[PDB]
């Protein structure tokens, strides 16, 4: 007899899969050994980033009065933020479009 | 017989349900979020591997991952990600 299994995600209080992250760290040829806390810490960081972007995109979607997030909303959320934009400067988002921006000198009057 | 694929869609949806219970997400937006998660995973893992190699450590630890987070994530993203990860690691150790 042995105790009922308790996922490492639940033990850390995370939604992201700590076991999957640990497997990917081991199989990715990143190091010979992997500490037990590394997949937990990394899963927490990935969860934070995912939550931040998804909540900003949900705010953007609500401002457009639509219920589901689309690449346009993800693009808007990422580009309207200094830190997310500088983190993802070199990245192209498919079907994301561009921010509305017209130079002042091009306007009439 | 076709093999089983693998994606972060379930976890991204669970996080979306926590941050915006009523909000949904498109399939292509889910694909972009999977790309984001994979890219950031690869960046932190590569930087932590380089840190271990520079310091001649055989192990990738939470300290290496934290240093990689501080190097990669700019500004307050670094501080909040460090806080979230430290909280998760402390809770995991306590449990």
């Amino acid at each position: 007899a042995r105790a009922k299994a308790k996922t490492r995600s639940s033990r850390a209080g995370l939604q992201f899969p700590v076991g999957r992250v640990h497997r990917l760290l081991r199989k990715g040829n990143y190091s010979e050994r992997v500490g037990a806390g590394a997949p937990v810490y990394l899963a927490a960081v990935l969860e934070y980033l995912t939550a931040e972007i998804l909540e900003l995109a949900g705010n953007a979607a609500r401002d457009n009065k639509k219920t589901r997030i689309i690449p346009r909303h993800l693009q808007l959320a990422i580009r309207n933020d200094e830190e997310l934009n500088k983190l993802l400067g070199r990245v192209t988002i498919a079907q994301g479009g561009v921010l509305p921006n017209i130079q002042a000198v091009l306007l009439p009057k | 017989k076709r093999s089983r694929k693998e994606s972060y869609s379930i976890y991204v949806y669970k996080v979306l349900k926590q941050v915006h219970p009523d909000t949904g997400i498109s399939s292509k937006a889910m694909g972009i979020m999977n790309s984001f998660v994979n890219d950031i995973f690869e960046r932190i893992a590569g930087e932590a591997s380089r840190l271990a190699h520079y310091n001649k450590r055989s192990t990738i630890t939470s300290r290496e991952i934290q240093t990689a987070v501080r190097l990669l994530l700019p500004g307050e993203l670094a501080k909040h990600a460090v806080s979230e990860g430290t909280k998760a690691v402390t809770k995991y150790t306590s449990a």
Epitope: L56, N80, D81, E82, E83 | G75, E76, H80
Partner: single-chain antibody
Framework: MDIKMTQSPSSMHASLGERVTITCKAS??????LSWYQQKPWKSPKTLIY???SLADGVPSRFSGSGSGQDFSLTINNLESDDTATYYC?????????FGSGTKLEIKEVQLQQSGPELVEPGTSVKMPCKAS????????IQWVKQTPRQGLEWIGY????????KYNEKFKGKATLTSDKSSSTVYMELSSLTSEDSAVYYC?????????????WGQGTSVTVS
Amino acid sequence: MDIKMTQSPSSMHASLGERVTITCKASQDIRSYLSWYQQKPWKSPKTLIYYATSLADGVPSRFSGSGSGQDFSLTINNLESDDTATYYCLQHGESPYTFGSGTKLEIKEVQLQQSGPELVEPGTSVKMPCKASGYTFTSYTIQWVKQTPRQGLEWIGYIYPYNAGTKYNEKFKGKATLTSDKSSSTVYMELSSLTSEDSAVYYCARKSSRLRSTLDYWGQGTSVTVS
């Protein structure tokens, strides 16, 4: 519809060393986006707790925050003479930010230069600068808060220097206007059609664009007096 903040204990008298607990209710769930502020008289408020549990930089472990959803609490463990100040809970989970009614307690480098006091006559306009220094100007929003002795603290709005984006409280639309100047790292607030009701102290406060980040550094305040 604006989220009502309810600090149940309006005032406490307490001796040194003993514990005090302050509570703050919410009319709607705010998902842990609540902050606590300590304001000594004739001084700008300072941040104590953010994200309902996290100690701000330089805050000793004496202060403790707890709760989520609608029930929140601030706990002080080892009182000193310096703890005599007013404590406000602030929610930022919804677009119109709302402070608490304020709780008085009696015990028995980022810089934001703000302009000095300004005497003004009704119906004209005034322009208040907020000169920020010591950090990446474009990376953080500048928040403006109005403090009257009779309504306490009121959030007016913010400007984001990165994209010149602005958001205003409905009560202050038209009354208030925000502008930024990257070259001098300065943010300007214009008040239009001054009225005797407008007599208040106005603060500019830095707040990051991160959703869990709170108003962390405050200007010394600019008192506007209407004849």
